């Protein structure tokens, strides 16, 4: 109000193209929700575990949740996983888990309470939306409650990563219908339990189990918004369908105001004169094209390069190839 | 004769002519122009149906009275 516009004193410095690295994602030491998306197969998810084991060095304690539907994830450490998290081999702050699609809230985290529970979930099934944030919702209060300094999502190339990034709007709107939902099935509960069970205690079930999980989802959205705390990393290849997508998906987080400034550029060709391939150079050709399409329009994102890999790398090894790759740019191939 | 009238017509002139120049672009050859143009119209866009709201909210309070 009173200062001085502080671009009067010094002029204005000029336009640096940021690091082709995720350091900045590392010195961030107020991060606990980093989301790695975009349409990716593979790369991504190689690129979301080698992310978390180099946050792992610096940090406390990391979690890898995966909503992918495919188990990626399990195949690029060369260990399987499930919904409890298990150690990684040879690191011990790495935890790592694989949620299903359905989330695997199917089952919640007397046979009277189970068939009211039951009722609910089943009329829940009629809006898929609600439902599905719900779910989410669930898995966020486990991780809530497991208390971890950071968690990194490898997150579905579809929309419902987008359902996910605004469950706690979802759950806000859909409390109607919850209450709704729960009007109708608590007096048939209690009709049916005293009538025929003389039991009444199930009806006072499933009361308080909503008056706590909100304020929960609220912090959790207050959380996502906060730059600090939240960040999106897209991943994409340098090809014109990747490059629209990615913007489309830039454009939807800027809407639900989810932060994002870093991209990655995976599957990267490039020619080396020992060992001549023509498809490659036509690959690197456009490539190239959209890359420099990329680095003008991107200009206020850290975009890491990221080379494809001969088809013989598999396993952890890739994995921690990537994982210097993506502090350190790599190198071009002529020698 | 209002400045909220005004001001919708020359949001709308400034969309159209943003509209009109992003026909000539090239998608796939000049990318990036094509994204900043879509990004303005759509801030743009964003802003007018805001202000439009905002009068049909005004214009409810008056026909149908609270």
Redesign the interface.
Known sequence: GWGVEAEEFEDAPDVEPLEPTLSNIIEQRSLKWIFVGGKGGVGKTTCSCSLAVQLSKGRESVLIISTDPAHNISDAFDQKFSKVPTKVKGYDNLFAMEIDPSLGVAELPDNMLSMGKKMMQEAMSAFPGIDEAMSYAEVMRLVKGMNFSVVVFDTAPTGHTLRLLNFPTIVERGLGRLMQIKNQISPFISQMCNMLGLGDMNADQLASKLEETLPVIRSVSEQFKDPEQTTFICVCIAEFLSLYETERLIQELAKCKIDTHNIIVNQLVFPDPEKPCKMCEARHKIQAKYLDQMEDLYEDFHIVKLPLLPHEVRGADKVNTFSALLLEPYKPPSA | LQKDAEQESQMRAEIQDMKQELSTVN??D???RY??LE?KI?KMTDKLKTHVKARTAQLEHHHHHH
């Open positions: 998608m796939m000049e990318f990036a994204a900043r990004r759509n």
